[PDB]
Design a binder for this molecule. Structure first.
Ligand SMILES: Nc1nc2c(ncn2[C@@H]2O[C@H](COP(=O)(O)OP(=O)(O)CP(=O)(O)O)[C@@H](O)[C@H]2O)c(=O)[nH]1
Ligand SMILES: Nc1nc2c(ncn2[C@@H]2O[C@H](COP(=O)(O)OP(=O)(O)CP(=O)(O)O)[C@@H](O)[C@H]2O)c(=O)[nH]1
Ligand SMILES: [Mg+2]
Ligand SMILES: [Mg+2]
Lengths: 267, 290
C-alpha cells in the first residue's frame, strides 16, 4: 500500500502536467487514496480505480441536450474571449438541423468588429436564419426581439451568440444576466477552451454562481493539450460537459464521452 | 483584493519555512508556472533560507522575483521590436486560433502610427469568416491603408506578397501581416506559414524582420508545445502575451522564454486600441506576484 502513496504523488504530477486545477487535483488524490485503503492484481487495480474516478467525476456517461417540452428550445452561449463561441453557435445549428430540428441564430455580439457579419456568414453556410438588430439596441433587447421572432416563426431551436467577457468584469457579467433573464433559456452552455490552464475551476464557478449554467462545450480538442480543464467543470458546477469541438469545419461538433476524456487526460 | 503571496509570506520564520514554502508552491502552480519550474524555484528558495541568506518575508519575496526575472532574461536578443534597415520592415503575427492576433496587430499599428511610422496592413487571414472585414475596421481606426484579397480562393502567401510589394513601391516603413489561426498540430497549415515567410523574403532581403507569436494568457502548460513547434517551423522572434487583464497570470510564459530564448515583447491588457504595452520584465514580475 503506502508504497502506493509513492505513485500517488506521481499521478498528482501527471494531473498537474495536464492542467488540472489544484483543488480538483487534491480532492481527486484523497478520494482515490481513501478508496485504495478500503478496496484491498494490485497494480492493474490502482489503474482501474484512477481511470474509473476520472470517468465518474466527468459524468459517467454522455449527457444529452435537453429540449423544451412545449416551446422553442433556447440555448445561450457564453465564455471568455477567443474560445470559439461564434463558431460553436453555427456548429450547433448544423448539429441540431441534422436531427430534423429547425434553427435560428441570434447575433448578440455588438462590440467586436465584424462579429455580426461573422455569424451571418456562418449561418448562410449551414443554412439557418440569423436574427440581427440595428446599432444601439443592447444585447438584452436583441435577446427579447430575437426570441419573439423565433416564437412567431415556430422555430424548434434558438441559439444566441454573445461577446466574450471577463468573468471578473462586473458590467459585462451583469449584461449576461440580463440576456439570460429575457431569453429564459432551456440551456446555458459555457464554452471552455481545452487549452485553458489553472483558472478553469474558478472560471466555471464564477459563471455558474453569477449566471447559472446547465452544461458546457469544450473546444479545440484537435489540439494536443491533455485537456485537464475538463475535469473541473462537473466537479465545481454539477453540470456536465455535453459537446466537444475538434476543428474549424461546421461538422466538427460531437458528444462528450467521459471515458474518452479520461484516457486523454492520462494520455 | 487579496495579495496571496504577500499574505502567506507574512507567516514566515525559520521554523515555519516548510509550511510557508508548501503554501508558496500551491500559489505558483495556481499561476500556471507548472510543477517543473515551481519545484526549481521553491527548492532554490529553501536552500537560500536554510543557509541564512534570506532573513525575512520580503527578502524571500525579492529572491522569488529575482529568480523569475533571471529566467525571463535567458534570451539571446532584445525585447525591442527589431525592424530592419530596409524599407519596408515586415512583421508577421501568428499563433493558435483565438489568442488575439488581429486585435494585437491593430493595437501595434496604433503604436507605430503615434510614432510617425507609416504602416500598411495585410489581411493574410483568407480563411475565417469576416477576417478581412475585421482587419479593415482596425485599419480605419488606426489610419492605416490595408491590402485585402479580391477573391475567395486567395492564398495567404499571395496577399502578403502583394502587400510587401506595395509597401516597397510606396515607401511604407512597416508592413503588418495578419494570418489565420492555426494549431501547431496541423502540418499543412504550418507549411502555409513557411510559404508566407519565403514569399515575403523574395521581395525584401531579410523579410520578415519580426515573426511575433501570440500566446493566450488563459492557456496553461500547452503554451510550451505551441512555442516549440511554431519556432521550429518558421522561427519566432518575439512573444505577445495577451489577456493578462483577466484572472489568468500567464505564468507559463516563464518556461517558454527559459527553454526557447524568445523574448516576450508585448502584453495585451484589454480590447481597446491602446491596450498593448511593451514588455517590461520588472512590471510583469511585480504584477504576477501581487
Ligand atoms: N482548431 C480549432 N479551431 C477552432 C475550434 N473552434 C473554433 N475555432 C477557431 O477559433 C477561432 C476563434 O473562433 P470564434 O468563434 O470567433 O471565437 P469567439 O469566442 O466567438 C471570439 P469572441 O469572444 O471575440 O466572440 C476561430 O478561428 C475558429 O475557427 C476548434 O474546435 N478547433
Ligand atoms: N480581455 C482581452 N481580450 C482580448 C485581448 N486580446 C484580444 N482579445 C479579444 O479576444 C478575442 C479574439 O481576438 P482576435 O484578435 O480576433 O484573436 P485572433 O487570434 O485573431 C482569432 P483567429 O484565430 O480567428 O484569427 C477578441 O474578442 C479580442 O477583443 C486582450 O488582451 N484582453
Ligand atoms: Mg462574436
Ligand atoms: Mg484573426
Amino acid at each position: 500500500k503506502d508504497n502506493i502513496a509513492e505513485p500517488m504523488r506521481d499521478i498528482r504530477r501527471a494531473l498537474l502536467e495536464a492542467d488540472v486545477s489544484l483543488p480538483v487535483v487534491r480532492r481527486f488524490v484523497q478520494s482515490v487514496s481513501d478508496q485504495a485503503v478500503g478496496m484491498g492484481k494490485p497494480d492493474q487495480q490502482l489503474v482501474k480505480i484512477v481511470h474509473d474516478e476520472l470517468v465518474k467525476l466527468m459524468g459517467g456517461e454522455v449527457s444529452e441536450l435537453q429540449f423544451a417540452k412545449s416551446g422553442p428550445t433556447v440555448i445561450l452561449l457564453a465564455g471568455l474571449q477567443g474560445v470559439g463561441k461564434t463558431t460553436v453557435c453555427a456548429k450547433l445549428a448544423c448539429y441540431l438541423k441534422k436531427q430534423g430540428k429547425s434553427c435560428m441564430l441570434i447575433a448578440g455580439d455588438v462590440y467586436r468588429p465584424a462579429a455580426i457579419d461573422q455569424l451571418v456568414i456562418l449561418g448562410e453556410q449551414v443554412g439557418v436564419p440569423v436574427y440581427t438588430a440595428g446599432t444601439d439596441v443592447k444585447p438584452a433587447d436583441i435577446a427579447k426581439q430575437g426570441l419573439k421572432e423565433a416564437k412567431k416563426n415556430n422555430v424548434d431551436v434558438v441559439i444566441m451568440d454573445t461577446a466574450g467577457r471577463l468573468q471578473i468584469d462586473k458590467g459585462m457579467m451583469d449584461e449576461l444576466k440580463d440576456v439570460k433573464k429575457f431569453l429564459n433559456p432551456t440551456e446555458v452552455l459555457l464554452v471552455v477552451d481545452a487549452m485553458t490552464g489553472q483558472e478553469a475551476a474558478a472560471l466555471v464557478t464564477t459563471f455558474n454562481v453569477e449566471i447559472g449554467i446547465t452544461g458546457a462545450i469544450l473546444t479545440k480538442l484537435d489540439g494536443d493539450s491533455r485537456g485537464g480543464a475538463a475535469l473541473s467543470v462537473k466537479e465545481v458546477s454539477g453540470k456536465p460537459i455535453k459537446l466537444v469541438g475538434r476543428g474549424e469545419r461546421m461538422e466538427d461538433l460531437e458528444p462528450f464521452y467521459p471515458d474518452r476524456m479520461a484516457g486523454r487526460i492520462l494520455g | 483584493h487579496h495579495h496571496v503571496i504577500d499574505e502567506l509570506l507574512l507567516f514566515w520564520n525559520l521554523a515555519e519555512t516548510d509550511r510557508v514554502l508548501d503554501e508558496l508552491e500551491e500559489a505558483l502552480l495556481v499561476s500556471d508556472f507548472g510543477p517543473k519550474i515551481t519545484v526549481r524555484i521553491v527548492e532554490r528558495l529553501r536552500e537560500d533560507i536554510m543557509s541564512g541568506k534570506l532573513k525575512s518575508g520580503s527578502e524571500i519575496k525579492d529572491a522569488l522575483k529575482e529568480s523569475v526575472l533571471e529566467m525571463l532574461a535567458k534570451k539571446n536578443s532584445k525585447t525591442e521590436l527589431q525592424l530592419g534597415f530596409r524599407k519596408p520592415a515586415v512583421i508577421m503575427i501568428v499563433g493558435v486560433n483565438g489568442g488575439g492576433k488581429t486585435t494585437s496587430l491593430g493595437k501595434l499599428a496604433h503604436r507605430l502610427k503615434n510614432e510617425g511610422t507609416k504602416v500598411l496592413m495585410a489581411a493574410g487571414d483568407t480563411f475565417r469568416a469576416a477576417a478581412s472585414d475585421q482587419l479593415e475596421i482596425w485599419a480605419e481606426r488606426t489610419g492605416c491603408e490595408i491590402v485585402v484579397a479580391e477573391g475567395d480562393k486567395a492564398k495567404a502567401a499571395t496577399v502578403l506578397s502583394k502587400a510587401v510589394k506595395r509597401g516597397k513601391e510606396e515607401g511604407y516603413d512597416v508592413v503588418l501581416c495578419d494570418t489565420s489561426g492555426r494549431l501547431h498540430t496541423n502540418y499543412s497549415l504550418m507549411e502555409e506559414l513557411i510559404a508566407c515567410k519565403k514569399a515575403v523574403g523574395k521581395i525584401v532581403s531579410g523579410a520578415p524582420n519580426e515573426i511575433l507569436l501570440v500566446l493566450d494568457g488563459n492557456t496553461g502548460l500547452n503554451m510550451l508545445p505551441q512555442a516549440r513547434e511554431f519556432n521550429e517551423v518558421v522561427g519566432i522572434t518575439g512573444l505577445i502575451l495577451t489577456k493578462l487583464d483577466g484572472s489568468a497570470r500567464g505564468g507559463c510564459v516563464v518556461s517558454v522564454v527559459e527553454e526557447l530564448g524568445i523574448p516576450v515583447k508585448f502584453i495585451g491588457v484589454g480590447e481597446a486600441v491602446e491596450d498593448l504595452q511593451p514588455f517590461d520584465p520588472e512590471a510583469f514580475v511585480n504584477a504576477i506576484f501581487s
